Structure 1
Amino acid sequence: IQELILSEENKTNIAVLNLGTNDRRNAVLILETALHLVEKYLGKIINTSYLYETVPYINELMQNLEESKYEENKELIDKCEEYETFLKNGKVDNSILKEVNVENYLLECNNIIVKNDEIMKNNSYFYNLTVVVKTFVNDPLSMLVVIKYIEELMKRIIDIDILFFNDFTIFMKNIKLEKNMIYKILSKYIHLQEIINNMVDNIEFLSIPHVYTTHRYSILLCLNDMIPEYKHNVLNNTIRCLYNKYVSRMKEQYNINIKENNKRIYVLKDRISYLKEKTNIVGILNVNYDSFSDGGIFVEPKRAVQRMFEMINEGASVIDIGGESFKISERDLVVPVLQLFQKEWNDIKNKIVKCDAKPIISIDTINYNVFKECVDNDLVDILNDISACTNNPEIIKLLKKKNKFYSVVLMHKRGNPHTMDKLTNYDNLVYDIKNYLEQRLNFLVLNGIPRYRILFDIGLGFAKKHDQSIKLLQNIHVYDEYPLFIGYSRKRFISHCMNDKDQLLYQKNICGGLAIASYSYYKKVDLIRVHDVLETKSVLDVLTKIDQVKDPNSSSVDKLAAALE
């Protein structure tokens, strides 16, 4: 019924979308622009999967955008009933579109694939990300209209499909839309010309669940991040069970490991990172230590920015700056130093020789006010929050802006520098800490921090005995699935693992450090937060070389050649 598609009785529905692009260079910019528009025109993003590389400007737009009929709020949430109900297949309001039969849907899907399987033989990088939206849109077909519009607004390849919509089984085998009925639907949610034309024909049909849902690997891979337990009448088994079957079966039958050519992405600034493919160095700039070790009482902002440069040319991708330490204010330590850096940089950016050399800037803070000022003056790109956004969750709201997002590091601790040493009792150390972080992430994701921008840090030496810091290292494979940031540098636990008497122990500690760096390298930790950037980079370089083999067959081939001589 066309009349209740336009009726302004606003509804709350659960949609799950696929979002893809081809443009490797700017997948992060493309998909994050989609993402922000999805958050604008459809509802609130309440889940996301990792970004994946898979195998089968707009800065002008972001100012000239029309408003929406519905108000957004950055406000934090704890749960979601709508969502809770989506996952178990509890009762929801009836489909205001025609539901095709259960057993009818099966054969219907086939013909759209097998026919497309022929259009194929007329005849290469995909970048996938799935989302969940709490939608004020009232029906899939309406949303598709808006999705098509969003698609169109971004053109001068950005496919945004729709994978599910409540528990509905829908096929509309052949529809065309009124060149005008679109205007009505669009004006329903948006405040409005030259675009609608190219739209009208681009909505040839509609399948919920989307056709390729369980045939495309890239979609299972993504859906498994977000909603593993979810079942649907439409499919035999739960999304995790199907995903697993696709893996095992791809191995038994075709002798391929599918995970190799389909990679997980985490994002530090604006660029793609292949989970587990590198160990990045993070250089510690502690303004307290740098300033008050002379025994001196003054900040030396010029000194600090120099140390910042030292660090960059010593091979650190990320610099992590901190005002807290373990009568002058945190902010007054950090912001001026971040300020002098930003300037000093742009006064050598003229030489575009250092333009793709610019280091990522991470602020170690639990303070909202400090973070706000930093973001507001484009001074940082990552929040490093040792309280896991526990000291003040509101800080999460500062991790998303008009278009752009910021990546966060979440660390586990108990208590504080003075109290933590005795807060050492765990039921199950490794798993408690893992579960802790998995949960902070869930919370960030529920609030539409994109899953692929959150990094775990086990917090070595925070509320952990030296034996515990070791145990956490021994079991680091538990973070095999996740971006992992760690910080062993200079901590006392290193020394404890060892059989003028006070200067030896700093060498022993820095050198013992370099061991954990090696271990980190082989365990494929994602970032390590270090003081001794040159020493670390050296170690890492030698280890990388030893690993870069020219021919991966050569040792057997060569072995045989010897045996025949």
Structure 2
Amino acid sequence: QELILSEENKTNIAVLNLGTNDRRNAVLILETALHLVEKYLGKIINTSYLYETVPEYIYINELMQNLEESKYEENKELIDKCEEYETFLKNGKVDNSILKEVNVENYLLECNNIIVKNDEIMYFYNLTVVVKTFVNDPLSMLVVIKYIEELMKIIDIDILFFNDFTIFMKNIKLEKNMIYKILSKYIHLEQEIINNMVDNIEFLSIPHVYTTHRYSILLCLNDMIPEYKHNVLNNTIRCLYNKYVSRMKEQYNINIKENNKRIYVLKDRISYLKEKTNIVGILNVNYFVEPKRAVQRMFEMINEGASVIDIGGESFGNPKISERDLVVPVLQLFQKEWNDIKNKIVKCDAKPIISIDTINYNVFKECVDNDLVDILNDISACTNNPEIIKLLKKKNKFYSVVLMHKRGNPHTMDKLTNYDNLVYDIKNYLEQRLNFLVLNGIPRYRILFDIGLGFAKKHDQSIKLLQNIHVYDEYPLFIGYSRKRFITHCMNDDKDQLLYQKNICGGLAIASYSYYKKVDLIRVHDVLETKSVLDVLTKIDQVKDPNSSSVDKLAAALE
């Protein structure tokens, strides 16, 4: 089977799974795996969310710089469709398997064995990806995958699928040149590494053994490929996923979701979806500029409770100063000030996340290259310049993004009000945007949804989007209601000094609502007022003993 090393380039679809148990470093570890996969295997065109997952019963920064170059070559360029991947999804006719393919009944029994053999032989942070690969075979990829593992040194990368193939290779152990040969074909090579690998490649199963048995795997695949149907499976990934969840409720009285949590990432750390309402402080430099003043306003917001600061330099209501001249210097003064540290040598938890509210590629490029920002807040949902998406992946870094719905601009917005179906048009729009970024290899868990309150919505439509916010229960949700006219509209009425108060207080009501609907991030001017509110509500929800209400009631009834 020597044509494994054929230099004739193929295009292949491979679905991977990546797991670590280092919680403190999950983001860092798994985004490092991702970058290496991108570098050494092909193009990432789908990813699941990050999940904290329970088991199924019951120096990187310096090593990143010097890395063997790939023999293949990278285009960060954008794509609309993928013909190969579309074929993988429908199961369509793909070139026959290089390796020998076992049949389904033969495959099932081999996997029966491996599960039971390991059943008897007796926190996870999981992620799936889809690779468009220039690798000819799953085994060659497994050689590379395990070399990726080996250099990273903690990190487990499996191969869940390879095209439509059904494969169970029992006898595997091979030439320490054959390993050198595979790794000569794809990576531009510069000794103890291979030794550890020959031992580990005992066998190969395509699809993976625990594909249909580990919940955490179904959970990841249900994000990426809900409709996929391998010949090996009884049903589509989503149906399996549903049966698993349904069946765990009927037969064990367990909701399996409870111990397996969806994660979104803002900067470098895990955030559990729906578990915290984060405050985002508004700094509109636009509001003859005062960069010293505006940076103290930034610090004012940090001490007031904001986890995230949102900075932009355009007006939503200006003679000759540019957007860049408004935001880059303030951000630079912030980085300068913060960095002349006076408080701690352990300030890895205390730093505010910085978001830039821009649609301009050039602004965001300058920011990213000067390490000035963490999050792109793009109110066009990257529709003004999709190339901006490219600036979200550096060689090692990833950046997170807020995608927001609007129509038109502040001057034309208020008229652009007709929707076929308000709630679902806006939801469908955003999922579409997410599909695009995900196709272009923006990690799904780094993408935040924003419905764009007051942007091309009548005030009753702003209210209605809020009435139906549960529609984002599956998603990181970032909203901005602060000081907008729809809040005022709700009120049954020196006159406009009262109006400003009535508006800030009505905002605080949406803070509460947002707290109960479990919104991930809220974009507010009045950071103190909001944090106060959130603190009280968080306290009222901290129940020391969760079923004491019924106990105490019975204690009273029998006096």
TM-score band (shorter)? over 0.9
Shift of 1:194: 3.2
Q: Which of 116, 119, 133 is the matching residue for 1:135?
A: 133
User: How far apart are residue 356 of structure 1 and its match?
Assistant: 1.7
Distance 1:502 1:29 in 2: 49
SS at match of 2:464: helix
Q: Deviations over 1:333-361 (max 9, x none)?
A: 00000000001001126633644210000
1:44/1:135 contact within 8 Å kept: yes
Deviations 1:356-413 (A, max 9, x none): 2100000000000000000000000000000000000000000000001000000000
C-alpha offsets along residues 147-197 of structure 1, whole Å, 9 cap, x if unaligned?
000000001x20000000000000001211111100000010000133111
Of 162, 171, 175, the residue aligned with 1:174 is 171
1:15-72 deviation line (CA, Å, top 9, x unaligned): 0000000000000000000000000000000000000000012011101101011101
Q: Deviations over 1:108-155 (max 9, x none)?
A: 1101111111111xxxx0000000000000100000000000000001
What residue in structure 1 maps to residue 9 of structure 2? Answer: 10
SS at match of 2:34: helix
How many angstroms apart in 2 are the aligned matches of 1:272 and 1:175? 38
Matches of 2:80 and 2:160, distance apart in 1: 25
Q: Identify the residue that residue 219 of structure 1 maps to in structure 2.
A: 217
Further displaced range: 344-353 or 477-486? 344-353
Please report how far the alpha carbon of residue 310 of structure 1 lies from its aligned counterpart in structure 2 after TM superposition: 0.1
Relative to structure 1, the CA distance from residue 98 to residue 349 in structure 2 (aligned partners, 3 Å threshold; closer, same or farther) is farther
Once residues 348 and 43 of structure 2 are traced to their aligned partners in structure 1, the CA distance between those partners, rounded to angstroms, is: 35
Post-superposition Cα deviations, 1:488-531, rounded to whole Å, max 9, x if no partner, equal: 00000000111101100000000000000000000000000000
Aligned to 1:558, the other structure's residue is in SS state helix
Distance in 2 between the 1:71 and 1:309 partners?
44
Counterpart CA distance in 2 for 1:68 and 1:262 is: 36
Contact 1:461 1:491 in 2 (8 A): yes
Q: Is the 8 A contact 1:490 1:510 kept in 2?
A: yes
1:106 Cα deviation from its structure 2 partner: 1.0
CA contact (8 A) 1:363 1:383 kept: yes
Describe the SS at the equivalent of 1:528. Answer: strand
TM-score, normalised relative to structure 1 = 0.97
CA RMSD in angstroms comes to 0.7
1:486 is matched with 479
CA distance in 2, matches of 1:139, 1:523: 47
SS of the residue corresponding to residue 17 of structure 2 reads strand
Structure 2: runs of 5 or more not aligned: none
CA distance in 2, matches of 1:317, 1:532: 13
> Can you list the C-alpha shifts for 1:276-296, whole angstroms capped at 9, x where unaligned?
00000000000000xxxxxxx
Q: Distance in 2 between matches of 1:468 and 1:131?
A: 37
Return closer, same or farther for 1:349/1:220 CA change in 2, 3 Å cut-off: farther
Distance across 2 between alignment mates of 1:450 and 1:524: 22
Residue 436 (structure 1) aligns with: 429
- Give me the whole-angstrom Cα distance separating, in 1, the residues matched to 2:381 and 2:542: 36
Q: Are 1:343 and 2:345 an aligned pair?
A: no
Which blocks of at least 5 consecutive residues in structure 1 are unaligned?
290-297
Tell me the CA shift for residue 76 of structure 1: 0.2
Cα pair 1:382 1:409 within 8 Å, conserved: yes
SS in 1 for 2:202: coil
Distance 1:489 1:503 in 2: 16
Question: 1:523 and 2:517 equivalent?
Answer: yes
- CA deviation profile, 1:422-451 (whole Å, cap 9, x unmatched): 000000000000000000000000000000
Q: Which residue of 2 aligns with 1:67?
A: 69
Structure 1 residue aligned with 2:538: 544
Supply the distance in 2 between the matched residues of 1:543 and 1:6 (Cα, whole angstroms): 62
Distance 1:154 1:60 in 2: 12
* Pair 1:37 & 2:72 matched: no
Q: Deviations over 1:63-115 (max 9, x none)?
A: 11010111011000000000000000110000000100121111111011111
Following TM superposition, by how much is the alpha carbon of 1:198 offset from its aligned partner in structure 2, in angstroms? 1.1
Q: Contact 1:284 / 1:321 at 8 angstroms: preserved in 2?
A: yes
Distance 1:544 1:13 in 2: 49
- Counterpart check, 1:313 vs 2:306: no
CA distance 1:196–1:353, change in 2 (3 Å): closer
Distance 1:216 1:408 in 2: 31
Matched, 1:81 2:83: yes
Partner Cα distance (2:183, 2:72) in 1: 13
Q: Separation in 2 of the partners of 1:477 and 1:317?
A: 24
Q: How big is the shift at 1:325? A: 1.1
Say whether the 8 Å CA contact 1:46–1:447 is kept in structure 2. yes
Give the share of equivalent positions with the same residue, in percent. Answer: 100
Q: Distance in 2 between matches of 1:408 and 1:357?
A: 21
**Could you say which residue in structure 2 is the equivalent of 1:553?**
547
Offset from partner CA, 1:240-283 (integer Å, 9 cap, x none): 00000000000000000000000000000000000000000000
Q: Relative to 1, partners in 2 of residues 1:355 and 1:232: Cα closer, same or farther, differing over 3 Å?
A: closer
SS at match of 1:397: helix
Q: Distance in 1 between matches of 2:488 and 2:343?
A: 45
Task: Confirm or deny: 8 A CA contact 1:364 1:384 kept in the other structure.
Answer: yes
Match of 2:345 in 1: 352
Distance 2:335 2:178 in 1: 51
Does structure 2 retain, via aligned residues, the 8 Å contact 1:280–1:316? yes
Alignment pair present for 1:563 and 2:557: yes
Q: Is the 8 A contact 1:349 1:355 kept in 2?
A: no
C-alpha offsets along residues 219-258 of structure 1, whole Å, 9 cap, x if unaligned? 0000000000000110100000000000000000000000
Q: 1:162 to 1:517 in 2, by over 3 A?
A: same
Aligned to 2:208: 210
Mapped partners of 1:353, 1:371: distance in 2: 29
Structure 1, 388-397 or 176-185: larger mean CA deviation: 176-185
Which residue does the alignment assign to 1:322? 312
Cα distance, 1:514–1:420 mapped onto 2, change above 3 Å:
same
| 2:192 counterpart of 1:200 | no
Separation in 1 of the partners of 2:507 and 2:365?
A: 34
TM-score (normalised: structure 2): 0.98
